[PDB]
Design a binder for these strands. Structure first.
Lengths: 133, 136
DNA sequence: CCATTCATTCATTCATTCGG
DNA sequence: CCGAATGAATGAATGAATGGT
């Protein structure tokens, strides 16, 4: 907890209500940002901001981009991992956040998954713990 | 089913009687929730709850919101859709038994076989899959 | 007025690019 | 090669439209 996170929550909550009152969807705000940013975002990225599911540094950046736009908008292929593997992987994650290159292959065989998918899983799992909750 | 689902049925029955005895319609309950929730629901959403046509997690969520409303409401108060042909739906349900999650290619094979757009068939299987995840 | 369907939005995973 | 910044593809929740089954 910190005065910056509190001001971050307040803005994310205020951005959500004013976005809905203005009739914008998460996909629309992500699209209508090239005017203030020079490139558009995605409904995924916006959802992460409103729910603060991104890093603190990324949040301060996007809050700056989004605050300038909000004012300006005031007018008049994938492979899904089994449920049994996820609780096991999350269980392995509790005992070793950073597993070795050999531990990854040893578990990839225990779960019948490719080496990369288990490797990237722990990567994304680690980044998940770097969020603003 | 599980002991938690049993308590879920029980509440829906008690919610339905207390909702009707208080003279609330499904559309009215959805609107009269902004006072205790901050945003309203829809007659569709309420109907799904009474019939337990939602996911187990979703039912527990709504049961929490609606129970808080019942307490607060029992202490002061008293575009266009395109319909898919019947022959195609029976065909899709026939296709669904031999493959719940069809590939991107089977969807085009069925869209042509049933004279439907590819997206319409994609969303059908999506909604069909969710239908097997609801509690009732 | 309730039930059911088609259609869309919001949330989450798995995945890829690209600076230090 | 590591991790930070981002999204397409997927699963999840919720509505408007339509049909009364």
């Amino acid at each position: 907890d910190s005065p910056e996170i509190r001001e971050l929550e307040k803005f994310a909550n205020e951005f959500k209500v004013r976005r809905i009152k203005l009739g914008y969807t998460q996909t629309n705000v992500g699209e209508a940002l090239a005017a203030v940013h020079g490139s558009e975002f995605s409904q995924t990225t916006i959802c992460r901001f409103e729910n603060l599911q991104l890093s603190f540094k990324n949040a301060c950046k996007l809050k700056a981009i989004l605050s300038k736009w909000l004012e300006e908008a005031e007018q008049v292929r994938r492979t899904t991992i089994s449920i049994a593997a996820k609780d096991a992987l999350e269980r392995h994650f509790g005992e070793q956040n950073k597993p070795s290159s050999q531990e990854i292959m040893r578990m990839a065989e225990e779960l019948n998954l490719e080496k990369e998918v288990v490797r990237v899983w722990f990567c994304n799992r680690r980044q998940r713990e770097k969020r603003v909750k």
